[PDB]
Amino acid sequence: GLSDGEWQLVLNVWGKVEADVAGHGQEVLIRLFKGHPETLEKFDKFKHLKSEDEMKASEDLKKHGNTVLTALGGILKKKGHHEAELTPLAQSHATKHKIPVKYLEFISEAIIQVLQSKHPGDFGADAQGAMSKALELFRNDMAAKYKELGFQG
Ligand code: HEM
């Protein structure tokens, strides 16, 4: 449900993430886990991190943040015509990783916070509104797929 100009604002600030995907991805998962501690409990591999300093040092957390934002970028570049990219993620998150839809709101919040924290000058009011709409469209489509698969949306 985005306009073409709102997709361009999203893809233009996504270019800042592409200049450093793993660094943004690491900061998103740290913000997700420090903001909403219960999300960390879905990651069996990341329990042992008892602090933001242990999370910062974890090369596996950084590698997983990289994988997370590389997939999200694949989804955003499709501008809404993203069913083929979205399906595999809704499949794996609804079944194997046991992620509720609400946790998707939390990581959406962490992404905006990261973008605002790292690019305050480039991520103004128009870019913010457009990225919020993009992440809402992703969340909504993820939830519709979960319902299709027999899960709570
Ligand atoms: C923008 C939203 C998200 C994206 C793009 C994303 C993407 C991914 C990708 C690409 C993988 C590896 C492939 C796969 O298994 O599907 C993955 C794994 C995983 N995701 Fe996400 N994810 C998102 C949100 C979440 C949230 C909010 C949680 C938990 C609160 C979560 C939990 C996990 C877990 C537990 C795994 C498996 C990790 C492991 O290797 O041990 N994901 N995610």
Swiss-Prot record:
Residues 1-147 form the Globin domain. The keyword Cytoplasm applies. Its main location: cytoplasm. The modification Phosphothreonine is found at residue 67. It holds the Pfam family Globin. It comes from the Eukaryota. It is an enzyme of class 1 (oxidoreductase). GO terms for biological process: oxygen transport; removal of superoxide radicals. It catalyses: Fe(III)-heme b-[protein] + nitric oxide + H2O = Fe(II)-heme b-[protein] + nitrite + 2 H(+); H2O2 + AH2 = A + 2 H2O. Nitrite binds at residue 64. Its EC number is 1.7.-.-, 1.11.1.-. GO terms for molecular function: heme binding; metal ion binding; nitrite reductase activity; oxygen binding; oxygen carrier activity; peroxidase activity. Heme b binds at residue 93. It is found in: Cytoplasm, Sarcoplasm. The modification Phosphoserine is found at residue 3. InterPro entries: Globin, Globin-like_sf, Myoglobin. Keywords: Cytoplasm, Heme, Iron, Metal-binding, Muscle protein, Oxidoreductase, Oxygen transport, Phosphoprotein, Transport. One of its GO terms (cellular component) is sarcoplasm. O2 binds at residue 64. Gene3D superfamilies: 6.10.140.2100, 6.10.140.2110. Monomeric heme protein which primary function is to store oxygen and facilitate its diffusion within muscle tissues. Reversibly binds oxygen through a pentacoordinated heme iron and enables its timely and efficient release as needed during periods of heightened demand. Depending on the oxidative conditions of tissues and cells, and in addition to its ability to bind oxygen, it also has a nitrite reductase activity whereby it regulates the production of bioactive nitric oxide. Belongs to the globin family. Monomeric. This is Myoglobin. It comes from Sus scrofa (Pig).
